[PDB]
Amino acid sequence: MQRTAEGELQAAAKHLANPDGTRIDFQAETIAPNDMGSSPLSSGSLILKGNQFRLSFGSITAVFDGKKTLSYYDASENTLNISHPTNAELAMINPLIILTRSEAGYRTAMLPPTKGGKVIGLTPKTANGIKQIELQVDSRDSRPTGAMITLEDGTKIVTKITGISRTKASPGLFRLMKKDYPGVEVVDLR
């Protein structure tokens, strides 16, 4: 007998439940329609604590407070940006958010498996810019191994997990203050 997709999703979430925090190392690539304007495969990290996360990827350091506010520093533009992201925008930068909070918006189904892995498919009940989310997990213990988000326009955001570890994440990792970026331009997008 084998678990439902919902069952596998809730077994995968257990791997991110360390109370003091979880560190995820990954590689990610965005493949744009017709491969025009794609972003190359590169490396990143996510620190999770409760509903908060700190994302390091590309030129960006981003923090989500677990409520409604995303703050991110872009080292290439020298801007500190504060915004109210949509639920879809959060999944696009942190696909594992589908595991850390209750989500009312997606139908769940099992997709064809891989060698030693399972594949869970999530499709929105209401249009939201996302066509499908695909979470890859290890067949032994449902440990997340990767994710792919396909946008309605065909963009593929592909994430490969290269490590999951324990960490003691302090309050300070989930805040960005203007003093920490000499000369930074603050842009309030709220």
Residue numbers in the entry: 0, 27 to 215
Sentences from the paper on this structure:
In Gram-negative bacteria, N-terminal lipidation is a signal for protein trafficking from the inner membrane (IM) to the outer membrane (OM). The LolA-lipoprotein complex crosses the periplasm after which the lipoprotein is anchored to the OM. In γ-proteobacteria anchoring is assisted by the receptor LolB, while a corresponding protein has not been identified in other phyla.
LolA from both P. gingivalis and V. cholerae consist of a large curved β-sheet comprising twelve β-strands. In LolA-PG the cleft is continuous and relatively open (36 Å3) as compared to the scattered cleft in Lol-VC which is occluded and only expose 0.15 Å3. The equivalent loop in LolA-PG is well ordered, probably due to stabilizing crystal contacts. The Arg-Pro motif is not present in LolA-PG or in LolA-BU. Instead, they both have a glycine located at the corresponding position (Gly75 in LolA-PG). The equivalent space of the arginine side chain is instead filled with the hydrophobic Leu41 in LolA-PG (Phe43 in LolA-BU). It should be added that when the sequence analysis was extended to include LolA also from other classes of proteobacteria it is established that the Arg-Pro motif is also found in β-proteobacteria (Neisseria meningitidis) but not ε-proteobacteria (Helicobacter pylori), hence the motif is not universal even among proteobacteria. Furthermore, there is a difference in the theoretical isoelectric point for the two proteins in this study, 4.8 for LolA-VC and 9.3 for LolA-PG calculated on the mature proteins. We investigated this hypothesis experimentally by ITC and could conclude that LolA from both V. cholerae and P. gingivalis bind polymyxin B. LolA-PG shows higher affinity for polymyxin with a Kd of 14 µM compared with 56 µM for LolA-VC.
